[PDB]
Amino acid sequence: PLVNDLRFINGINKFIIEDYATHDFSIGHPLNMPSFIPTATSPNGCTRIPSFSLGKTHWCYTHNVINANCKDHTSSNQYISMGILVQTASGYPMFKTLKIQYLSDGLNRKSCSIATVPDGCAMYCYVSTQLETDDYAGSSPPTQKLTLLFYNDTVTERTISPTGLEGNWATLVPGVGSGIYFENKLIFPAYGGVLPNSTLGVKSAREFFRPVNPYNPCSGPQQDLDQRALRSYFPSYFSNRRVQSAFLVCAWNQILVTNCELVVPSNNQTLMGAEGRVLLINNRLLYYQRSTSWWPYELLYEISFTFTNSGQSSVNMSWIPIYSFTRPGSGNCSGENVCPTACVSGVYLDPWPLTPYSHQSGINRNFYFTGALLNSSTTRVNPTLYVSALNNLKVLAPYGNQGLFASYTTTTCFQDTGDASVYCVYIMELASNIVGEFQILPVLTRLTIT
Amino acid sequence: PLVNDLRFINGINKFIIEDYATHDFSIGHPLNMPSFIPTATSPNGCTRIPSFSLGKTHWCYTHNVINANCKDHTSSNQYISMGILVQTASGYPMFKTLKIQYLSDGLNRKSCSIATVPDGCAMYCYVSTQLETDDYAGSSPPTQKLTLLFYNDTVTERTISPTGLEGNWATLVPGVGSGIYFENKLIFPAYGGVLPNSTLGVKSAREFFRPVNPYNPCSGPQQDLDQRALRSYFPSYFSNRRVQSAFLVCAWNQILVTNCELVVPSNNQTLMGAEGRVLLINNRLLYYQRSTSWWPYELLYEISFTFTNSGQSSVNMSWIPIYSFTRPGSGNCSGENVCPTACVSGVYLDPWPLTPYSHQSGINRNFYFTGALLNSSTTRVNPTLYVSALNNLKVLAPYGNQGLFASYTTTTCFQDTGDASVYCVYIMELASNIVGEFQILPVLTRLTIT
Ligand SMILES: *[C@@H]1O[C@H](CO)[C@@H](O)[C@H](O)[C@H]1NC(C)=O
Ligand SMILES: *[C@@H]1O[C@H](CO)[C@@H](O)[C@H](O)[C@H]1NC(C)=O
Ligand SMILES: *[C@@H]1O[C@H](CO)[C@@H](O)[C@H](O)[C@H]1NC(C)=O
Ligand SMILES: *[C@@H]1O[C@H](CO)[C@@H](O)[C@H](O)[C@H]1NC(C)=O
Ligand SMILES: *[C@@H]1O[C@H](CO)[C@@H](O)[C@H](O)[C@H]1NC(C)=O
Ligand SMILES: *[C@@H]1O[C@H](CO)[C@@H](O)[C@H](O)[C@H]1NC(C)=O
Ligand SMILES: *[C@@H]1O[C@H](CO)[C@@H](O)[C@H](O)[C@H]1NC(C)=O
Ligand SMILES: *[C@@H]1O[C@H](CO)[C@@H](O)[C@H](O)[C@H]1NC(C)=O
C-alpha cells in the first residue's frame, strides 16, 4: 500500500518547535541510503528543476530530463515518482519509490510543479514551444497542462484555461515548487507576464512593495525609492509586462472537468512574480517566493484564501520579516544590493520553517527556519546547509568543498514520533564531474535542537 | 505486468552477429535517461559491487550500500530492484524500475549475485562476520544465503548448505556476477578456498591450467612453468588453501526445500578461483572469470553441464583463446605480467560476446566481444568502452577524462527487433566528486556494425 511508516505520519507538516523560546542547533552528517532521485546517464545530458512534496501518507517527486545540453530547449521528458518513508536498520528512514512514471511523448513540458494528492500525484506544467522572452513578448499564453498520476497506474492529462487567464496574461508558468492539497483544493504556485493594458493590468497598476532591512537600509527619498520599486515590476527584458505571482486553484471534486481558477495577490503585499512554493504546516498556508527581483533576502509569506466559487477568490499574504543571508545574483542585482532596480536574477532556494511565526497569542520573534543556501553574493557555488533565525544564521554545514557549483535547493523537514528524531532532507542541484549538468542530490540529515 | 517492450523480448540473450565474417565497429555516444541505479546520498557513503541480469521479460539488479567508509566493514545493506525495458520518444529504450527492495535488517550480506527468475529475482549472498583472510584461515565456511524476491512483494530467505560444501571448503562466496535460470536450473558463479588434504582437495591435486600467449610467450622450461602455474593456485595470502571457482546449482521446482548443490570444474580447464559471471546466449552457457591470478587477459569459457540425481553432477569448460587487452594489477601481478606467479589482484570487468566462438559447423576466428576496460596496467583508472577481437582491439571510446578512477564493469547487449538497433549497457563503478566511492553508472550506447 501507499502509506508511510506509522512513526512519520504524525510528524509530517507540523511545526517542530512550538516553544516560542530560543534554541541552539546542530546539523548532522549526511545519512547514506539509495538515492530516490535518478541521475543522468550521460556526461553532457541535462537533469534539472526538482519539485518535491512529502505528504502525510506519501511523497511525490519530479524533474526535467534532456538528452542534450541544458541550453537545448527544443525537447525534454519528465521524470515523476511517488513513494513512502521506510525505516532502515541503519537507524534512519529511507525514501522508497513505489511508482515511476517517465513522460516522454515528444511533448515539451517545462517548469513543472508537483503535489501530493489522494492515491497519487498531480503535476502542473506548461508546454514550451519558444524562448521565454518570446513568451513574454507575445500576447498569448502557452499551453497549460494538468496531469494526474495515480498509484493504480492511471494517468490523465488535460489542457486547462483557468478563470482570469484569457486576455489578462502574456504568459503563465508553474512556479516549480510543490503545491498542496488542502480543504478539497489543489493549489499550485505560478508566475508570468501581465498585459498592462488589460483589466488586471490597469487594476494592479500603482501596486508595489518595498521591503526595507532595518540593519541594512537603502539610502534615498521615500517617493523616489517607491517609484523605482514600482518600476522594478516591469523589466525591459520581459518586454515591460508586469511580472506577477499567481496561484492556480483547482477543485479536487471537479478536478476532471473543472478548468480551475487563477488567484492573484496584491503587489502591495508581494514582490515581482517568480518561482515559488506553497506549504501547509499545521493548518496554516505559507508561500515561498524566489528572489528574482532586487530584494536579496529570503521571501516567505503567511497566506490565507477567501473562496467565492463565483470566479472572485482572493488571497491575502503577510510577509515574514526575514533578513539574514543573501542569494547570489549578477551585476547590480547581486546579493549585496539592497536597493530597488529592475532585476531578473537570483536562484531558487526554499526554506522550511521549524517554528510558527504568527500564532493566536501573538508573533514569534524566535522564528527559526532551515534549508540550503549558496555561499556567495555573485556566483552559484558552495552549497551550505543552514539553520537561520530572523536576523541571522544559527548554524552552517557546507556540503563538499569550496568551488562546488550548485543551483536549486528545496528542503523538507519531518519528525519521527517514535524516537523524537528530527530529519531534514535537502534536495539540491549539484555539479558533478562524471554525470551531466546537475546531479540532483537528496541529502538527509538529523537535526539536533537544544 | 512485468514484461519488456515487445521489440526487445526476442532480441535478448542472442548472438547479434552470426555472420562468422569480419566486421568494423563504432561505439555511439551515451544516451541520456533517468538512471535506474541509485547513488549514495553522502560524500563518504559506500555503494559498490553491482550485479545485473537482463532476462527475456525483465531485468534484475543489486548492489551493496554502506553508511560508512568502504574500508570499514561491519554493516551493509543490499539494494535490489527489478524492472523492464521501455521505448522512449527520445528514440531509445530506458530502464524502468517496477519493484524495489532495500534489505536493511542488520544482516551483513555481501558479494551478492543476482539472477532473473520467473516473476522476479533470485539472489545468492554470504554473511560476512570477519576478514576475508580470516575466512580463508578458518576451517569452516560463512553462512550461505539464498533469497527470492517476487513482483508480488513476496520475499523469502533461506540458509543453504549445498552438497559438497561441508568438510571440503574453508570458505565459499558468490561470484558477484549475475547467475542464470536455464532448463529449470538456477546457476550462480562462486569461488572460495578448498581445504588441502580434504577429499576434494586430494582429488583435485596436481590439477593446473597454463594459458600461453603465442605473441608474448614466457621464457623457461615447460616443467618449471607448469610447477609455478600449479603453485599459483595456493596463495599464502589465503593461507595456501586451493582457491577454486565453482557453480551453485539449485533445482527451481524444489527451490524452496532444495539445499542445492556445488559443481566444481577441473583445474586443468580453468585458472585460480575468482569472481565470475554465468551467461546464457542462444542455448549455450558461458562463464566469465575475473583475472585475479597471474594471467592478465580476458577469461571467457564455453561451458556445459552433466546433471545427475545425487551429487555426481559435473561441468566441462573450454577456454576461449583471448589475448587482446590487459587488466590493471599491483606488483608482479600487473597487466604486463604474462608469467605464472601466486597472485591476488586484478578487477572485475566482464565481456559481452557479440558472436559465437564454437558452433555446429566449426570454430569462429572472427569472434568479437564488447565491454568496458580500465586503461592502465597498474591503477584502476580511465574507464574505456571497447569492442575487441581475439588478438586485438577493434574500437575504443573512453568515458570521462584521463585520470578518472573506476573499478568494476559489467556489460550487457541486446537488440531492438523493431529498427534493428544494437544497444549495449556498460555498468561501471566511477569515482564521483560529490558522492561516495563509486557512483555506479549504467551507460547506454548504440553500437554500429559494418
Ligand atoms: C485509479 O484511481 C482513481 C482515483 O483513485 C480512480 O478514480 C480510477 O478509477 C482508478 N483507475 C482504475 C483503472 O481503476
Ligand atoms: C495598494 O497601495 C496603493 C497605494 O500605494 C493603494 O492606492 C491601493 O489601493 C492598494 N491596493 C491594495 C489591494 O491594497
Ligand atoms: C492581510 O495581511 C496583512 C499583512 O500584509 C494584514 O495586515 C491583514 O490583517 C490581512 N488582512 C485580513 C483581512 O486579514
Ligand atoms: C562562506 O564561506 C566562508 C569561508 O570562505 C565562511 O567563512 C563563511 O562563514 C561562509 N558563509 C556562509 C553563509 O556559509
Ligand atoms: C508470489 O509469486 C510466487 C511465484 O511463484 C508464488 O509462488 C507466491 O505464492 C506468490 N505469493 C503470493 C502471496 O501470491
Ligand atoms: C589433470 O592434468 C594432470 C596432468 O597435469 C593429470 O594427471 C590429471 O589426471 C588431469 N585431471 C583431469 C580431471 O583431467
Ligand atoms: C571438455 O572441454 C575440452 C576443452 O577444454 C574438450 O577438449 C573436451 O572434449 C570436452 N569434453 C566434453 C565431454 O565435452
Ligand atoms: C590508453 O591511453 C592511451 C593514451 O593515454 C591511448 O593511446 C591508448 O590507446 C589507450 N589504450 C587503451 C587500451 O584504451
UniProtKB/Swiss-Prot annotation, chains A, B:
Its annotated compartments are: Virion membrane; Host cell membrane
- Glycosites: 152, 197, 268, 316, 375
Q: Which residues of the full protein are shown?
A: 133 to 582 of 582
The entry describes its oligomerization and partners as: Homotetramer; composed of disulfide-linked homodimers. Interacts with F protein trimer.
> Keyword Disulfide bond: yes or no?
yes
Q: Which UniProt keywords apply?
A: Disulfide bond, Glycoprotein, Hemagglutinin, Host cell membrane, Host membrane, Host-virus interaction, Hydrolase, Membrane, Signal-anchor, Transmembrane, Transmembrane helix, Viral attachment to host cell, Viral envelope protein, Virion, Virus entry into host cell
Instruction: Supply the source organism for this entry.
Output: Mumps orthorubulavirus (MuV)
Instruction: Provide the effect of residue 237 to A.
Output: Considerably reduces the cell-cell fusion mediated by HN and F proteins
Reactions catalysed, as given in the entry: Hydrolysis of alpha-(2->3)-, alpha-(2->6)-, alpha-(2->8)- glycosidic linkages of terminal sialic acid residues in oligosaccharides, glycoproteins, glycolipids, colominic acid and synthetic substrates
What spans does the record annotate as topological domain Virion surface, numbered to this chain?
Answer: 1-450
Q: Where is this site: Binding to the glycan motifs of the host receptor?
A: 48, 110, 132, 191, 237, 275, 290, 380, 408
The EC number(s) attached to this protein equal: 3.2.1.18
Q: Which family does it belong to?
A: Belongs to the paramyxoviruses hemagglutinin-neuraminidase family.
GO cellular component labels: host cell plasma membrane; membrane; viral envelope; virion membrane
Reported function: Attaches the virus to alpha-2,3-linked sialic acid-containing cell receptors and thereby initiating infection. Binding of HN protein to the receptor induces a conformational change that allows the F protein to trigger virion/cell membranes fusion. Binds to the glycan motifs sialyl Lewis (SLe) and GM2 ganglioside (GM2-glycan). Neuraminidase activity ensures the efficient spread of the virus by dissociating the mature virions from the neuraminic acid containing glycoproteins.
According to UniProt, the name of this protein is Hemagglutinin-neuraminidase
Topology with respect to the bilayer: Single-pass type II membrane protein
Present the record's domain note. The C-terminus (head domain) is involved in binding the cellular receptor.
For this entry, list what GO says about its biological process: symbiont entry into host cell; virion attachment to host cell
Q: Which GO terms describe its molecular function?
A: exo-alpha-sialidase activity; host cell surface receptor binding
Q: Does this UniProt record's set of keywords contain Cell membrane?
A: no
Disulfide-bond pairs as recorded: 46-70, 60-121, 112-125, 218-339, 250-260, 333-343, 413-424
* Main subcellular location of this protein, as a coarse class: virion
